[PDB]
């Protein structure tokens, strides 16, 4: 894939124009076909501009220089460096989970609770404002018991905004380092549901607003991301179901469309299947 052609120009000191055109065509084709990405035109142009600017042929290792340009533009396209959760402000840190139904929001709250307790030694509250989907509040409660985080009780009778305000009060009164807020989603982008997410965000003033999206959705993930970024000040993105996306380019798309970093990757169904996103790692893998 992107590996194979990039290997063929790993150590070729000639870099003839046909060799550049052939390498660029397959990277264009693999980005376009291997995944649902349509902004490849911008990536190829930047790689072409840098190659002319840095005079790759002048270098002792022109193919290595050309691949270095491709990797560096890939790392930049994916966010340059890992950005962590916004936990250096004043406790409690409020993290709002936003996204469509089926993206993986409830599972990700459990994943983040495990990650925050085991790695950052933090006290964590989880609350669910999903009074619309059936059994969802119990689903968070069960996940909280599995990951060792505390749960704030919620009921279908309550209205989402009231639930979040009450949990924030517990988080401040009991000195919780982190409050994780799970929210209801719809399966397509819905304005009414987008209006209620706005009121919940306004009430709790979240330090972190995380957009959870399914990589398997492909191009639709970027469109969903733009709509959420437009109506919410997204601080980060969580890409789920990576373990089941053979294509693998929802990542590059989202950072381009939103300008917001991917902070975490969901790589499975279990609570430990969370991995922090490192653009320089992932870029080297492919
Ligand atoms: N392969 C994979 N699937 C994921 C991942 N994250 C979430 N899922 C799927 O999402 C389901 C649970 O998360 P959801 O409750 O649906 O997420 P949301 O609906 O957006 O939040 P919400 O409940 O509305 O608050 C899981 O079902 P199950 O846990 O029953 O397992 P299985 O994969 O076999 O089905 C998974 O199907 C991931 O990282 N990798």
Curated annotation (Swiss-Prot):
Disruption phenotype: Essential; deletion experiments lead to loss of inner membrane protein targeting. Also leads to reduced targeting of lipoproteins Lpp and BRP. It is an enzyme of class 3 (hydrolase). GO terms for biological process: protein targeting to membrane; SRP-dependent cotranslational protein targeting to membrane. Composed of three domains: the N-terminal N domain, which is responsible for interactions with the ribosome, the central G domain, which binds GTP, and the C-terminal M domain, which binds the RNA and the signal sequence of the RNC. Involved in targeting and insertion of nascent membrane proteins into the cytoplasmic membrane. Binds to the hydrophobic signal sequence of the ribosome-nascent chain (RNC) as it emerges from the ribosomes. The SRP-RNC complex is then targeted to the cytoplasmic membrane where it interacts with the SRP receptor FtsY. Interaction with FtsY leads to the transfer of the RNC complex to the Sec translocase for insertion into the membrane, the hydrolysis of GTP by both Ffh and FtsY, and the dissociation of the SRP-FtsY complex into the individual components. Belongs to the GTP-binding SRP family. SRP54 subfamily. The gene is ffh. Disulfide bonds: none annotated. It is found in: Cytoplasm. Keywords: Cytoplasm, GTP-binding, Hydrolase, Nucleotide-binding, Ribonucleoprotein, RNA-binding, Signal recognition particle. Its EC number is 3.6.5.4. GTP binds at residues 99-106, 182-186, 240-243. It comes from the Bacteria. One of its GO terms (molecular function) is GTP binding. This is Signal recognition particle protein. It catalyses: GTP + H2O = GDP + phosphate + H(+). Conformation of the Ffh-FtsY complex and regulation of its GTPase activity are modulated by the 4.5S RNA. Formation of the FfH-FtsY complex leads to a mutual stimulation of both GTPases. It comes from Escherichia coli (strain K12). GO terms for cellular component: cytosol; ribonucleoprotein complex; signal recognition particle. Part of the signal recognition particle protein translocation system, which is composed of SRP and FtsY. SRP is a ribonucleoprotein composed of Ffh and a 4.5S RNA molecule. Metal ions are essential for the formation and stability of the SRP complex. Interacts with the ribosomes, via ribosomal protein L23. Interacts with FtsY.
């Amino acid at each position: 894939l992107s590996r194979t052609l990039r290997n063929i120009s790993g150590r070729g000191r000639l870099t003839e124009d046909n060799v550049k055109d052939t390498l660029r065509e397959v990277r264009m084709a693999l980005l376009e076909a291997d995944v649902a990405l349509p902004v490849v035109r911008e990536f190829i142009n930047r790689v072409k501009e840098k190659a002319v600017g840095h005079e790759v042929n002048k270098s002792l290792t022109p193919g290595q220089e050309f691949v270095k340009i491709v990797r560096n533009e890939l790392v930049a396209a994916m966010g340059e460096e890992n950005q962590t959760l916004n936990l250096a402000a004043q406790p409690p840190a409020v993290v709002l989970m936003a996204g469509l139904q089926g993206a993986g929001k409830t599972t990700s709250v459990g994943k983040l609770g495990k990650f925050l307790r085991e790695k950052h030694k933090k006290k964590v509250l989880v609350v669910s404002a999903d009074v619309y989907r059936p059994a969802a509040i119990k689903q968070l409660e069960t996940l909280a018991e599995q990951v060792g985080v505390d749960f704030f009780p919620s009921d279908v009778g309550q209205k989402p905004v009231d639930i979040v305000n009450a949990a924030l009060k517990e988080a401040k009164l009991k000195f919780y380092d982190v409050l994780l807020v799970d929210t209801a989603g719809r399966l397509h982008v819905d304005e009414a549901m987008m209006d209620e997410i706005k009121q919940v965000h306004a009430s709790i003033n979240p330090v972190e607003t995380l957009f959870v999206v399914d990589a398997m959705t492909g191009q639709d993930a970027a469109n969903t991301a733009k709509a959420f970024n437009e109506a919410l000040p997204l601080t980060g993105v969580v890409l789920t179901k990576v373990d089941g996306d053979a294509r693998g380019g929802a990542a590059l798309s989202i950072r381009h469309i939103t300008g917001k970093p991917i902070k975490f990757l969901g790589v499975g169904e279990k609570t430990e299947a969370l991995e922090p996103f490192h653009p320089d790692r992932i870029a080297s893998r492919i």
